[PDB]
Design a protein around this ligand. Structure first.
Ligand SMILES: CN1CN([C@@H]2O[C@H](COP(=O)(O)OP(=O)(O)OP(=O)(O)O)[C@@H](O)[C@H]2O)c2nc(N)[nH]c(=O)c21
Ligand SMILES: O=C1c2ccc(S(=O)(=O)O)cc2C(=O)c2ccc(S(=O)(=O)O)cc21
Ligand SMILES: O=C1c2ccc(S(=O)(=O)O)cc2C(=O)c2ccc(S(=O)(=O)O)cc21
Length: 163
């Protein structure tokens, strides 16, 4: 399967899923209804400024390896992937209310609301995702919550690759 989300063409390379409508609670205890894809899947994300390779289990990002033009372009893809993954820590990183009433937001489903929320500011999302020690595996660097490259540590599951 092939589809678009957040400016990225996703192509499924492995795995399969069944979709199911589900409720989640934000960090502000707001209920959002999202369509959850159940099953382990692997995708290539093709964007105009970044490309990535995404592994996900149900509502869990397992791994993201991102290549791109620069910090912003690569963060853009990291944010898209984190939202797409539908992980609870991404949803718990929403600390205030999401506005479904105002006219400019009527086009947006909860998934696109979340995306927009993290595009405006990814700080809380990145801080609360979690961190891990990494290996010196080559071409690949870790990236810290402030998007600084690291050879020791990285946001959980996330690697930045050289072009
Ligand atoms: C989390 N997602 C989302 N997604 C696909 O990404 C596209 C983006 O749409 P979406 O806004 O998440 O949901 P969608 O089903 O289209 O609309 P809605 O739920 O508002 O009725 C859709 O084609 C959707 O099927 C996915 N596709 C696969 N294969 N696996 C997944 O985990 C996911
Ligand atoms: O808070 C929401 C809301 C929450 C979740 C979804 S859903 O995720 O599309 O099911 C959708 C919505 C809404 O569409 C909506 C419309 C009107 C109000 S109200 O004016 O605060 O009563 C709240 C909301
Ligand atoms: O094997 C790779 C490698 C393979 C594929 C890509 S890709 O272009 O992103 O697919 C990228 C890469 C790399 O960026 C890279 C960097 C450094 C080494 S090293 O000389 O063994 O240190 C190997 C590699």
């Amino acid at each position: 399967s092939s589809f678009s989300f957040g400016g990225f063409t996703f192509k499924r390379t492995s795995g399969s899923s069944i979709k199911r409508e589900e409720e989640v609670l934000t960090g502000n205890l707001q209920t959002l209804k999202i369509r959850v894809h159940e099953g382990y899947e692997e995708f290539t994300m093709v964007g105009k400024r970044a490309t990535a390779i995404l592994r996900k289990a149900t509502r869990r990002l397992v791994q993201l390896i991102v290549s791109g033009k620069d910090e912003q372009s690569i963060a853009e893809a990291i944010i898209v992937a984190m939202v797409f993954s539908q992980e609870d820590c991404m949803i718990k990183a929403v600390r205030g209310d999401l506005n479904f009433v105002n006219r400019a937001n009527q086009r947006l489903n909860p998934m696109h609301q979340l995306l927009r929320h993290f595009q405006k500011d990814a700080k809380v999302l990145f801080q609360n995702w979690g961190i891990e020690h990494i290996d010196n595996v080559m071409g690949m660097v870790g990236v810290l919550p402030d998007m600084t490259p690291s050879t020791e540590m990285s946001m959980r599951g996330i690697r930045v690759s050289k072009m």
